[PDB]
Amino acid sequence: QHWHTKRSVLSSLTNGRTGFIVDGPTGCGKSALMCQVVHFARSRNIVTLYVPDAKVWTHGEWCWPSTILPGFFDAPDAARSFLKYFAVANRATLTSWKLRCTPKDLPTEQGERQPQNLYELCEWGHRAVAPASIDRQSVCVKFLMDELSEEKKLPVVIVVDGWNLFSHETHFRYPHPDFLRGLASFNESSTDIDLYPQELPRIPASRLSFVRGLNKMILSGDDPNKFFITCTTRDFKPFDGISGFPNVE
Amino acid sequence: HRALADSLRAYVEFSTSKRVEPWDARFKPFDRIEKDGVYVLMRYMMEEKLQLCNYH
Amino acid sequence: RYKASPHGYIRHFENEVRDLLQYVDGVTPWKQAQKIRTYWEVRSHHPMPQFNRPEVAMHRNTVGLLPAHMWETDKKTGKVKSVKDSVRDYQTKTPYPKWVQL
Amino acid sequence: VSTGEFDHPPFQFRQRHTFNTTPLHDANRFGGRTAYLREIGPVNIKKQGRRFKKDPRTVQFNVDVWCAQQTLRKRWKQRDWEVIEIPFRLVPREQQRVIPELYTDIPQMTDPARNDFSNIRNKVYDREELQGVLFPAAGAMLYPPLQRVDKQAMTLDKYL
Amino acid sequence: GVHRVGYTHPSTLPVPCAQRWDLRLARARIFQEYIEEKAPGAWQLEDERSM
Amino acid sequence: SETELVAPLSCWTSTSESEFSPVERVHANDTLVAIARRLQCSEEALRAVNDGITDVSGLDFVRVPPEARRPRRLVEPQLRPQAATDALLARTIAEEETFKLKSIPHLPQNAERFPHEYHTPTSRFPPTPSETPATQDWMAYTAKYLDKQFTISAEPAPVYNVNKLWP
Amino acid sequence: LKIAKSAFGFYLARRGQRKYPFLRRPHIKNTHSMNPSAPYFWSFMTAKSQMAFLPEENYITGDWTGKFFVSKRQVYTLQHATSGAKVRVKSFPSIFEFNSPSRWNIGKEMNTLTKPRMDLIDEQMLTKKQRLDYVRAGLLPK
Ligand SMILES: Nc1nc2c(ncn2[C@@H]2O[C@H](COP(=O)(O)OP(=O)(O)OP(=O)(O)O)[C@@H](O)[C@H]2O)c(=O)[nH]1
Numbered sequence A: 001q002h003w004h005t006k007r008s009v010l011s012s013l014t015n016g017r018t019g020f021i022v023d024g025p026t027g028c029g030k031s032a033l034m035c036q037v038v039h040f041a042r043s044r045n046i047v048t049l050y051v052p053d054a055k056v057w058t059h060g061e062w063c064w065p066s067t068i069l070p071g072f073f074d075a076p077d078a079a080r081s082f083l084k085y086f087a088v089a090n091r092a093t094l095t096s097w098k099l100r101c102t103p104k105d106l107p108t109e110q111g112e113r114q115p116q117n118l119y120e121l122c123e124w125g126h127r128a129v130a131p132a133s134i135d136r137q138s139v140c141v142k143f144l145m146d147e148l149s150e151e152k153k154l155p156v157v158i159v160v161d162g163w164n165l166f167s168h169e170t171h172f173r174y175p176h177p178d179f180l181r182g183l184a185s186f187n188e189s190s191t192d193i194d195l196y197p198q199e200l201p202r203i204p205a206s207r208l209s210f211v212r213g214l215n216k217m218i219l220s221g222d223d224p225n226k227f228f229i230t231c232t233t234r235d236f237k238p239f240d241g242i243s244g245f246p247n248v249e
Numbered sequence B: 001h002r003a004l005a006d007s008l009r010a011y012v013e014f015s016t017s018k019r020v021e022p023w024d025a026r027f028k029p030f031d032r033i034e035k036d037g038v039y040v041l042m043r044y045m046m047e048e049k050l051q052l053c054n055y056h
Numbered sequence C: 001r002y003k004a005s006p007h008g009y010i011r012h013f014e015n016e017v018r019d020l021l022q023y024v025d026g027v028t029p030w031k032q033a034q035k036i037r038t039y040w041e042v043r044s045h046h047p048m049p050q051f052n053r054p055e056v057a058m059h060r061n062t063v064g065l066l067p068a069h070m071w072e073t074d075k076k077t078g079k080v081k082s083v084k085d086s087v088r089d090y091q092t093k094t095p096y097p098k099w100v101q102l
Numbered sequence D: 001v002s003t004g005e006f007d008h009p010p011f012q013f014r015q016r017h018t019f020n021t022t023p024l025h026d027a028n029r030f031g032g033r034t035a036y037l038r039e040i041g042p043v044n045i046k047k048q049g050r051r052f053k054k055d056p057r058t059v060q061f062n063v064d065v066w067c068a069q070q071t072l073r074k075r076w077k078q079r080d081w082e083v084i085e086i087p088f089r090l091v092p093r094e095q096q097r098v099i100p101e102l103y104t105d106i107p108q109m110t111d112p113a114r115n116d117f118s119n120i121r122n123k124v125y126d127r128e129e130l131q132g133v134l135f136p137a138a139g140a141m142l143y144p145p146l147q148r149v150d151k152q153a154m155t156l157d158k159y160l
Numbered sequence E: 001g002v003h004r005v006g007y008t009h010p011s012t013l014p015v016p017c018a019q020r021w022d023l024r025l026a027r028a029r030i031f032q033e034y035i036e037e038k039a040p041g042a043w044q045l046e047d048e049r050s051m
Numbered sequence F: 001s002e003t004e005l006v007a008p009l010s011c012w013t014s015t016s017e018s019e020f021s022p023v024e025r026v027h028a029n030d031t032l033v034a035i036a037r038r039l040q041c042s043e044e045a046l047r048a049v050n051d052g053i054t055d056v057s058g059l060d061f062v063r064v065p066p067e068a069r070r071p072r073r074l075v076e077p078q079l080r081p082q083a084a085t086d087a088l089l090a091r092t093i094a095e096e097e098t099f100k101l102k103s104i105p106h107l108p109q110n111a112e113r114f115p116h117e118y119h120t121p122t123s124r125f126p127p128t129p130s131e132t133p134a135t136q137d138w139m140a141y142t143a144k145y146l147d148k149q150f151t152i153s154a155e156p157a158p159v160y161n162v163n164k165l166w167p
Numbered sequence G: 001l002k003i004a005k006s007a008f009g010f011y012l013a014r015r016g017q018r019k020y021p022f023l024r025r026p027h028i029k030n031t032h033s034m035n036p037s038a039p040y041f042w043s044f045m046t047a048k049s050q051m052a053f054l055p056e057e058n059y060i061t062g063d064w065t066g067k068f069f070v071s072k073r074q075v076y077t078l079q080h081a082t083s084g085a086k087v088r089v090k091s092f093p094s095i096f097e098f099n100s101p102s103r104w105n106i107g108k109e110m111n112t113l114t115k116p117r118m119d120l121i122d123e124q125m126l127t128k129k130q131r132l133d134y135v136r137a138g139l140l141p142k
C-alpha cells in the first residue's frame, strides 16, 4: 500500500523476484488464496488486475492475429471481458489516472468522447458493436499495458490465477500457410488443407499481446512498482497410462 | 448401364454443387452472432476455401 | 540329398528364392508374359475410369469427368434416359498398352 | 486406473433412448466414433446391412484401435522434450554408464550412491544446462541461464 | 509435426559419435531385416490390451 | 561390328587399388595426429602423399598412403556384386533389348490427382501431407509468414541429431 | 434338407436358422455381387488394388480343346466387347451369355454383370404350396 517506504522490506520478502507464484496439488487453497488477495488489495484501494481464470486466454474460444502488433495474437473475448470488469473494479483510481502515452487521435463514432483517463480508455475498448470491438480491443490492450508499465509511483498488484498456463503454449496452432496464399481450385494447387488434418506448431502464450505486456513488465528491471501475486492450476484431466473414452453422463 | 450412367452423373453433380452449413449452430462456438467469433474467423480468413469445397 | 534345409518362414529360404527366380526367368518367354494385364490398364477403356470416392477427395470431382457425349439426357428432369452404343464407333490407338507387341 | 470405457457393449435386443439406457451406436459413445459402426434406421435384415457392423469380434477390434489412439495421443501430449543424440564425452556423469535397452533389465536407478533413485529412462534434462554442449558454435549463450531459488533466504514463507 | 527426418554424419559433428540410424543399418545387415520405407511415423500404437 | 566383352564374374581379379579407398574424410576436430592414428600410418607418411600439409582445417578429404594398415574398403564387402544378380536374370535382360523396353508405367497417367483411388498394396495410413517450408517451429513460421523483419529465422538448432519420432 | 435341388439335398441338414462365424458360411452364394454403386463402382466386389493383375481366369493356361463357360471371376475386357466371340458364364437355370457388348462392362468381374437372384420366377419349378407362399410375400400375382 505504501511500498516506496517499505522497498527494502518488500524486496527482501520476495528475494528480488517480482512477487510470488503459489503452487500445490489439485484442489488445495490456490484459487481461493488468490481470491483473498484480490479482496485485500481492492479493499485497501490499490489498482488491481485480476485474471480469475487464465484458461479464458490460452485455451479459448478463438484466436485473432493482433491488429497493431505484428507477429502477435489476441484472445478477443477474454480481452473484451477483461477490459470491462477491470474498468468497473478499479474505476475510482482509474479515473484519476491521466494518460502519459496514448494517441489523442483514437478512432471514434459521432457523439463519443476522446478518453482522458485510463478508465475512459478501457471503456473505449469494450463498448462498441461487434465486429468493431474486435480491432478496438487489440489497440486498447496494447496501450493499456503500455500505460501500466509507464507508471512508476502508484502500487499495482497483478493477480493471475493459473500463471502456469501463461508460461507455455496456448492451445491454438499457427494457421496452415495455405490459408494465407489464396487459391484457384483445390484440384491442383498442390494443397492438402482439405484432404488431411495436420498439426502446426502451437502458438506460445508469450506471443499473446496481453501476456506480452505482462512479461515485458516482469523481465525489464526498473519497474519496482508492480507486484505479481500469482497462482498455479493443476485442474488437468486425469491420465494414468491408459485412457478409455470418458462416459459423457 | 443407364442406371449406372445416371447415378454417376448424380454423384458428380452432388460433389460439384453447394451444401448447407455442416456445423450445428445450437452449440458453441457457432451459436455466436454472425458478426463475431468463429464467424469473423471464417469471413476474413477461411471464406475462399470454405466455398471451394462447397461446404461438404 | 543330405542338405541343410531351411524351414518355416520364407526369409530363411534365401538360396531357394534365387534359384526359383533364375529358373522362372529362364523358362518364361517375355513374349508370353507381355499379355498379363493390370486392372487399371484394362479399365482405361471404360467410359469413366477415374473419379474420387466419397472418403477423402470427393469435393474435388469435376463435371469434366462425366462422359456426357456417351449418353442421352432428358431436358426437363436433367436425368439420363438412354445410353448410346459404346463399341461400334470406338477408335483407340491402344487396345493393349503401348509397350506390348504381340 | 482410468474410469473410461474400453469395451464395446454386447449386441442384444435393440436398446432405445430411455432413462438409464441409450442406443448401442449412439453418438455419445467412444467420442462419436460410433459413426463408423452405424447402420441407421429400421434395417431390413434379409436385403440390407453391413455384416461387420454387427460382428462382436470385429467391432471390438475397431474400438480397441480407437482406445490405443487415445492413449498414444495423450502420451505424446505428455512429452515436453526431444531425444537428442549426444556423444559420450559431453554427457552428464549419470549417463556415463551402460544403459540397458528398454524391457531388457530391471528398471534402473539413476544414482543410488548420491541418493537419487529414479528411472534413468524418464530423467529429463534442461536445454539450458546442456547449452554449451548443444550449441557450441553460437558464442554468446542463446538461452539465458536459469535463475534458481535460494532455499536459505528469508522470504515470505519463512515468516520473515 | 510434419518434418523431414534428419541425419548428421559424424564427420560433421564437433565430436565424432556413432549415429543411432547408422547402428540401425548395422543391425539390419546382421539379422537380415526388411526396412519398411513407407512405415508411417504417426502410427506407433502399442496393443493396450495385451501390453 | 560389339566393341567389347565383359567377363563372367568368376573371372574378375581384385587389386588393392580398386578395393581400398584412396582417400579419407576429415572430421571437424581433426589433427594430422588423429587421422594417422585412425589409419595406423606414421604421420610422416601421411604428410608425404598430402604435400607436407600441416593444418587440415580447410580440407574435406586427405589422401591415404599405401603404407596405411587400417584403410576403408571402398564398398561393403558382404554386399552382393551386381554381376551376380544380373547373371540370375540373363534371359530377361536380353528380352529387354529385343523388345526395346524403355519403361513399363506402373500407374495410370493422372493418378496423383485421385488420392484415395490408387493404393498399392505397400501403401500405409495415415497418408503423409506434403511438406511446408517454414512450419517446423513458431520462430521460423513467424519469420516467413507473419512478421518478415523478424531477426531470428529459426529457433536454435542443436548441432547433434534430434530424433522427433522416438523411440 | 426339405427339397433336394442338387445331390447335397440328401447329405446336408439345415439345422434351422443357424449362425456361423463371421464371413464363413459353408456355401458361398453371392446374392449381393450385383449391387449397384456409382461412387463405389471401382472398389465394390472388385480388386482391392488397381495395380493387381487380372486373375488366372482371364488367360488360357494350357493346351485346351475349348471351354463351355468361362468363370464368373473373369474380368470383362475391351476385347470381350470388340472381338465378337462367345462369352458365357454359368448361372442358373443354365448359362448367361453376353450377347450385347458394351464398354460399360469393362473392368468389372462378370459376378457383377450377372444378377444372381432374378425378379423373374418360374411358376413351373414351384410346388403349389411354394407358389402359395410366394403369393403371400406378394411376389407372384394371385
Ligand atoms: N473459504 C475458503 N475455501 C477454500 C480455501 N481453500 C479451498 N477452499 C475451498 O476448496 C476449494 C478448493 O478449490 P480450489 O481452491 O479452486 O483448488 P485449486 O488449488 O485452485 O486447485 P486447481 O485449480 O485445481 O489447481 C475451493 O473451491 C474453495 O471452495 C480457503 O482457503 N478458504
Ligand SMILES: [Mg+2]
Pocket (backbone or CB within 6 Å): A030, A031, A232, A233, A234, A235
Ligand atoms: Mg484453481
